[PDB]
Amino acid sequence: NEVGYDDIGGCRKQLAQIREMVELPLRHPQLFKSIGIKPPRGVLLYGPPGTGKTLMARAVANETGAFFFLINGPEIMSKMAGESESNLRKAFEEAEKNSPAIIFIDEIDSIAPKREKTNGEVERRVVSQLLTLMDGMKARSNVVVMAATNRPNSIDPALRRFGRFDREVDIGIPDPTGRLEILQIHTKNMKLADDV
Amino acid sequence: NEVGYDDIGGCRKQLAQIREMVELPLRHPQLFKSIGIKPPRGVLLYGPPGTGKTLMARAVANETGAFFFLINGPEIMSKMAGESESNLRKAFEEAEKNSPAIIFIDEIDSIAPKREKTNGEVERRVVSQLLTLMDGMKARSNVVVMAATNRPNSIDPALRRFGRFDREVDIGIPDPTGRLEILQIHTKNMKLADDVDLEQIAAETHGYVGSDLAALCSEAAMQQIREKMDLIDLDEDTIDAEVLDSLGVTMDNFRYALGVSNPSALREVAVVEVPNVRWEDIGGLEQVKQELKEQVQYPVDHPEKFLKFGLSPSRGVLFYGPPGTGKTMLAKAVANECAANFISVKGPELLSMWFGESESNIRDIFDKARAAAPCVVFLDELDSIAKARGGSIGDAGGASDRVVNQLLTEMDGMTSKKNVFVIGATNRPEQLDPALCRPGRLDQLIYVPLPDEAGRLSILKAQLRKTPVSKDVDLAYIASKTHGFSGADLAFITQRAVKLAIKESIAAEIEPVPELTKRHFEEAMRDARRSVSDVEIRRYEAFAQQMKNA
Amino acid sequence: IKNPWEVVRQSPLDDRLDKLDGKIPRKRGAMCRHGPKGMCDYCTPLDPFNPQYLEEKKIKYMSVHAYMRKINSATNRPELGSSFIPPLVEPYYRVKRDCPSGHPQWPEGICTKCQPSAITLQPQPFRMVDHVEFASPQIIDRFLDAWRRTGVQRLGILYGRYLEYDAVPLGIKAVVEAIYEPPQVDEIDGITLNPWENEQEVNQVAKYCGLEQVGVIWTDLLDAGKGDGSVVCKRHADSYFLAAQEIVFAARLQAQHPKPSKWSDTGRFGSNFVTCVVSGNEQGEISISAYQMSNDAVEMVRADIIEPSADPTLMLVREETRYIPEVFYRKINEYGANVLENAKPAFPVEYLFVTLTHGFPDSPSPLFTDNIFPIENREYVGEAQEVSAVAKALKVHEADAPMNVSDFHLLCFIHQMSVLSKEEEALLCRVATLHDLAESFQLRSTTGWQTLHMILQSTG
Numbered sequence A: 001n002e003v004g005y006d007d008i009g010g011c012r013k014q015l016a017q018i019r020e021m022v023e024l025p026l027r028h029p030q031l032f033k034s035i036g037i038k039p040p041r042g043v044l045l046y047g048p049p050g051t052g053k054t055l056m057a058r059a060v061a062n063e064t065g066a067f068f069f070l071i072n073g074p075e076i077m078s079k080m081a082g083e084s085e086s087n088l089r090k091a092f093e094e095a096e097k098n099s100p101a102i103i104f105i106d107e108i109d110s111i112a113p114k115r116e117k118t119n120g121e122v123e124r125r126v127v128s129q130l131l132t133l134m135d136g137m138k139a140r141s142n143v144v145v146m147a148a149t150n151r152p153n154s155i156d157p158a159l160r161r162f163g164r165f166d167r168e169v170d171i172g173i174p175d176p177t178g179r180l181e182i183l184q185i186h187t188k189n190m191k192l193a194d195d196v
Numbered sequence B: 001n002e003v004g005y006d007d008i009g010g011c012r013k014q015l016a017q018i019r020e021m022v023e024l025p026l027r028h029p030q031l032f033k034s035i036g037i038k039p040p041r042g043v044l045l046y047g048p049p050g051t052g053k054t055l056m057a058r059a060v061a062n063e064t065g066a067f068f069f070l071i072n073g074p075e076i077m078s079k080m081a082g083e084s085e086s087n088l089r090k091a092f093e094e095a096e097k098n099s100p101a102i103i104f105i106d107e108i109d110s111i112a113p114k115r116e117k118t119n120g121e122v123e124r125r126v127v128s129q130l131l132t133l134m135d136g137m138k139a140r141s142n143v144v145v146m147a148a149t150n151r152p153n154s155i156d157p158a159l160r161r162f163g164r165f166d167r168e169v170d171i172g173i174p175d176p177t178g179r180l181e182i183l184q185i186h187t188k189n190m191k192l193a194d195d196v197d198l199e200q201i202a203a204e205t206h207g208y209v210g211s212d213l214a215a216l217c218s219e220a221a222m223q224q225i226r227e228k229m230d231l232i233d234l235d236e237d238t239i240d241a242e243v244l245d246s247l248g249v250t251m252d253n254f255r256y257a258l259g260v261s262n263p264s265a266l267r268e269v270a271v272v273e274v275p276n277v278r279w280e281d282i283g284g285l286e287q288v289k290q291e292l293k294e295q296v297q298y299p300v301d302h303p304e305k306f307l308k309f310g311l312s313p314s315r316g317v318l319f320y321g322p323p324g325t326g327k328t329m330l331a332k333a334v335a336n337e338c339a340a341n342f343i344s345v346k347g348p349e350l351l352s353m354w355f356g357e358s359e360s361n362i363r364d365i366f367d368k369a370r371a372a373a374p375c376v377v378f379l380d381e382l383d384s385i386a387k388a389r390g391g392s393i394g395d396a397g398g399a400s401d402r403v404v405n406q407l408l409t410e411m412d413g414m415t416s417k418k419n420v421f422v423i424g425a426t427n428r429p430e431q432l433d434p435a436l437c438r439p440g441r442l443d444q445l446i447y448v449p450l451p452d453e454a455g456r457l458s459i460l461k462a463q464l465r466k467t468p469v470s471k472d473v474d475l476a477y478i479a480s481k482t483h484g485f486s487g488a489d490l491a492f493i494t495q496r497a498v499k500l501a502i503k504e505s506i507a508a509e510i511e512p513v514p515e516l517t518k519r520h521f522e523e524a525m526r527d528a529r530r531s532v533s534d535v536e537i538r539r540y541e542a543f544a545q546q547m548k549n550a
Numbered sequence C: 001i002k003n004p005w006e007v008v009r010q011s012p013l014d015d016r017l018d019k020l021d022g023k024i025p026r027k028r029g030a031m032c033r034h035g036p037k038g039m040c041d042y043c044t045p046l047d048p049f050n051p052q053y054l055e056e057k058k059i060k061y062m063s064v065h066a067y068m069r070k071i072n073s074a075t076n077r078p079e080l081g082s083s084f085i086p087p088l089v090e091p092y093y094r095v096k097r098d099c100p101s102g103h104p105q106w107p108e109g110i111c112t113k114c115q116p117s118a119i120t121l122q123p124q125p126f127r128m129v130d131h132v133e134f135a136s137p138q139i140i141d142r143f144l145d146a147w148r149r150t151g152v153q154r155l156g157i158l159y160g161r162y163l164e165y166d167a168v169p170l171g172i173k174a175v176v177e178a179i180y181e182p183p184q185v186d187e188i189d190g191i192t193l194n195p196w197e198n199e200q201e202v203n204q205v206a207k208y209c210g211l212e213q214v215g216v217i218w219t220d221l222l223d224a225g226k227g228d229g230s231v232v233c234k235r236h237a238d239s240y241f242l243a244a245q246e247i248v249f250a251a252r253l254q255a256q257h258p259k260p261s262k263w264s265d266t267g268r269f270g271s272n273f274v275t276c277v278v279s280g281n282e283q284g285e286i287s288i289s290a291y292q293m294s295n296d297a298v299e300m301v302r303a304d305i306i307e308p309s310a311d312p313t314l315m316l317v318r319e320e321t322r323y324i325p326e327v328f329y330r331k332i333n334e335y336g337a338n339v340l341e342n343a344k345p346a347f348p349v350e351y352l353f354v355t356l357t358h359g360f361p362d363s364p365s366p367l368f369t370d371n372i373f374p375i376e377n378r379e380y381v382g383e384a385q386e387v388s389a390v391a392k393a394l395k396v397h398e399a400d401a402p403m404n405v406s407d408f409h410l411l412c413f414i415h416q417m418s419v420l421s422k423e424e425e426a427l428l429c430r431v432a433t434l435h436d437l438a439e440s441f442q443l444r445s446t447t448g449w450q451t452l453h454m455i456l457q458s459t460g
């Protein structure tokens, strides 16, 4: 139930990106400090549904020595009014406390639809809570925000603008080579016959 | 009020699924533990309304030794804000406490509509409460979530994604065999008379759900009481027991109850149903009979030669010809031969469900046929799709509209490995676009000619199989005189001749002749009239000579 | 015939309170866009019901008149007479009697047109009385002599009058003058009454004196065992404030004392009758907590709905003649939301009272200046009512000595002696409350007070 790099397979090029984007600033923030650039804090995952997007989060997160915090989309939207936006403020204070930190948010579109295409102001607050708290972060915090969705278009694009989410990372459909690897992941726990 | 397996009947294949999905992980979680796979916790029921979907829940639930936790749809939605989402949290903690657990949720769409198509955030919270709490479960909990609906499309699809609900289980309309069993369930509590033939009833009932049949049983009971109302005085506080002992429901009460408002079933959807017509009931055209025996029966019977030969077949068959040539019955008889499932879809059925915009159902036609593979999908009245824009001449709009553009996607969105088959039939084949006639989509084109006099003989043999005809009837002398007359025309003559016979039958009764005389015929033979012009045939014969020029 | 508010008659205080708007006039505020005889959005006169004004002045609820002038327009006013709508509605949580829908009475018949509504126990947005001016500490210091000698609790009855309390806008103050106590069997944590026997008699003294039964007082004085007067801090935030048996029992007496009103549908609204609990503070000194049941809390006792629990903070809802629908209470959670929780089967007792301030005058000048009488119903401590004290109390064998009747306990004892007739005792309670010299000289020349002399010049 605790995911390493070996537990995911096939999307090697995508994992090559995220290790440059997440593993790299955390175990070596000095590199961006030596080169004098800002670490990207706007890692965004997207793709088709059911493509390991939640799986690749912990595949990176458990392979750091960094603190991790987890946010589910509908879990915040399940909460009452005001209290739901409290948990986001409770999220980032813990991450800015434990400064090597990973914040993954699964199903980001549920807490962030388009503000043009929405009805409840409670939805509009929690978007506005999110847009505020993304900008309240610091580069000295060394805290990485991850977010995943299956509908990259339903999001309010103000997140996808600069400073908040810049790293659009798509998880494509794997080739028959990579999905062969995925079968080997699930069947190595299974008990098979030799004809397989 | 407590339901066993015997209390439900007919849908045996569906119950075979659920026992593999629910009974199997609970009484033996070791099997998935020994094989090392995850037990599916995403059992979803769906079907038409009133089809025992609530009934089959307790039919499984009471037949476990597991804990059960009932959860209704409108009961949560009846509750106030916040408190409604509390009960869901109050639900799963008890189930994860009593770890062999069954959670059935009736009418899941009421607590889970589409989040795109909803207004209240309270609805959006309780969906978000549900999506959260489904994922909060564990495999060590060994807790199974059941959910039922009558509208599988109105649900937020995030539930129907992986990890939450994977086991789409449809409860179809039962056959006359299975609905016979359903009648025996309701009538074994009832007190009947000896004339009652449920098998005669179950033959005469074709598109009923069990709720319709239970209402059918309840209706004929009342007419039995209506016959006793003369012997029953309502001012009395208690009627005597002698009329209670004589209170036995007759067969004719069901004959009354078959012609009542009960009959109005729920048949106005995209249905799958095994047919009843066979090859003997369609006279003539044995060439294109064998062509269907070639083209569609060989894949459904033997895919082994294809992988031997490395070639996927043509999955697209188009019927065409003049109108009234029995093209509707052709796909039914071949699905009745190789026992494949059958889906009849007519032209305006696409359109009338798209004035209400049922196009996921159009995808679900292919999905349910994929769910009911082997299945053939029959598209009746393809001219009506052209007649949605009038024709190919039409209102200057051709056959192509939103229907075609949907179908060309869904026809191309079919795996060639699947034995799911698509059968098209029109009578105006020039008036259809070649984009639908494209290879890969519909490349087999089958002309349906008029029969000859031998075919017209074989039809009149086949049409009169259930009619008490006279003995002097020279059908060949009829077949000699009937030349340009279609197979529809021949049945039309018999409808005239039977009407001519009833113009002798109940005429004689008001002035049993169960014979269809030559005098009944030679009147209709003199009154016989051709429905198809030969110059129309010379079009189709030129298409039968060559339509591949398009 | 007429309305009740066309035949009922207000108190003179309610006559005094009607002719005022109670408006708080601002001068030229911040965003004045005007000359000094113009106005802006920020230099209007203020409201008696103004919440920002009540918040800055730390005032909990508005007065019932400030409630009255809030909920009603100024045109809708009983000097119209016939065309008047009473804005106040006395609650009717019993059962729609004489139901006009064909079904029987409530009993044997019910429909929608006869059922009452489910109760939303919000906090009551107003109160009747704001300040409880105890007119003298010697009123209390006499009254607490039973507890210092015994240690068990004490119940009384607030007597006095209602005057303008000008510190809060439209404030009515329960000016407290006097206490009489019925026969009762006293215990420690609760008190059960004996029936009160001279019910018309002591009320006649208040009718003489110009007082009335304005409320109830009792004590929750449990000495904390260190010998100073400190209490177990038991009526505070963490414990509770009102015992729920006290709530029902006071609402029994409060239903026995409503107030007639020309602004309510029955011609009566609310209650002049108030409630006080003598206790101790955190600082260990003898304190007082004054309350009153809400108009729902009176009605749910009148309609027999709520019930005390073992937990004093929890109030039970009675299970099933009657009709018990939902009860709610609006909350404020940790993010300000209003959640009506199901009050069945139990709920906090917070939503039933109103808070009142309490104190003293700057200098004690009550209608009573004398303290010479041993209190009734205390024969268990040997403190009884006998005729022999009047030789020293009114000083009648010392026949020169002036009139010491300025003592309601003694005035009821003089009324227990019942010697002076209805005009001469109202000439006594004239002089017992106003103390006029020529009218004392009239009363010392009246026959019946000289009869009260010459009878008590011959006792022992």
Ligand SMILES: Nc1ncnc2c1ncn2[C@@H]1O[C@H](COP(=O)(O)OP(=O)(O)OP(O)(O)=S)[C@@H](O)[C@H]1O
Pocket: A007, A008, A009, A010, A048, A049, A050, A051, A052, A053, A054, A055, A056, A107, A148, A149, A150, A182, A185, B161, B162, B163
């Ligand atoms: N590429 C993959 N490699 C390995 N396992 C996979 C892969 N894609 C899906 N899975 C499995 O399927 C599950 C689906 O979870 P996710 O794909 O991460 O959910 P998702 O991708 O965020 O899409 P959702 O949850 O429907 S929005 C994973 O937890 C894995 O168990």
Ligand SMILES: Nc1ncnc2c1ncn2[C@@H]1O[C@H](COP(=O)(O)OP(=O)(O)OP(O)(O)=S)[C@@H](O)[C@H]1O
Pocket: B007, B008, B009, B048, B049, B050, B051, B052, B053, B054, B055, B056, B107, B148, B149, B150, B182, B185, B209, B210, B211, B214
């Ligand atoms: N296939 C069936 N076999 C036996 N009894 C049935 C069948 N279908 C319906 N009934 C009876 O009719 C009732 C209808 O209830 P259900 O079909 O279980 O409700 P539903 O299918 O969830 O559809 P709803 O309630 O209208 S959304 C059942 O409780 C049975 O009494």
Ligand SMILES: Nc1ncnc2c1ncn2[C@@H]1O[C@H](COP(=O)(O)OP(=O)(O)OP(O)(O)=S)[C@@H](O)[C@H]1O
Pocket: B281, B282, B283, B322, B323, B324, B325, B326, B327, B328, B329, B427, B451, B459, B486, B487, B488, B489, B491
């Ligand atoms: N060769 C035939 N053999 C048996 N029945 C036939 C034959 N030709 C027509 N019929 C009857 O004609 C009727 C209509 O059949 P269909 O297939 O609907 O005709 P069609 O060729 O599809 O043209 P339309 O517009 O639908 S009537 C049915 O009652 C058939 O039984």
Ligand SMILES: [Mg+2]
Pocket: A050, A053, A054, A106, A107
């Ligand atoms: Mg996911």
Ligand SMILES: [Mg+2]
Pocket: B053, B054, B106, B107
């Ligand atoms: Mg149901």
Ligand SMILES: [Mg+2]
Pocket: B327, B328, B380
């Ligand atoms: Mg047809």
Ligand SMILES: [Zn+2]
Pocket: C028, C029, C030, C031, C032, C033, C034, C038, C039, C040, C041, C042, C043, C044
């Ligand atoms: Zn101004």
Ligand SMILES: [Zn+2]
Pocket: C096, C099, C100, C101, C103, C110, C111, C112, C113, C114, C115
């Ligand atoms: Zn009524």
